[PDB]
Amino acid sequence: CDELAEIILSRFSLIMQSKFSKIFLSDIQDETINQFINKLYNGAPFIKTDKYIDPE
């Protein structure tokens, strides 16, 4: 049970650690991001922006 407890400690820590997110980098109050997220979350096959947002 000592060997089983350690594995569960590692297995549970991996569950809580494994959480994914999408991170947008921009100026701290650039209201384009909020508009961009609103389009992206909903359906948006095509989004038009400028060169300065640099999606890649």
Partner 1 sequence: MYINNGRINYNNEYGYRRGIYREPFYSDNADYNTNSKSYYDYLARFNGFIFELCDF
Partner 2 sequence: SKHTTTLYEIIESELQRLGLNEFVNNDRIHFNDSKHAFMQKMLYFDDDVKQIVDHMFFKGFMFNDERIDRYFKESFTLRFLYREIGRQTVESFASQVLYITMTHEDYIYRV
Residue 10 contacts partner 2 per CB under 8 A: no
**Binding segment (CB under 8 A) for partner 2, from list 1-9, 11-19, 29-37, 40-48:** 29-37
Report the Cα 9 to chain-centroid distance in Å: 26
Nearer to partner 1, 4 or 23 (CB): 4
- Among positions 6-45, residues that touch a copy of itself (CB under 8 A) are 6-10, 12-28, 33-34, 37-45
Tallying the residues shown for the chain, one arrives at 56
Tokens standing for 21?
């997110």
Tokens standing for 8?
């569960």
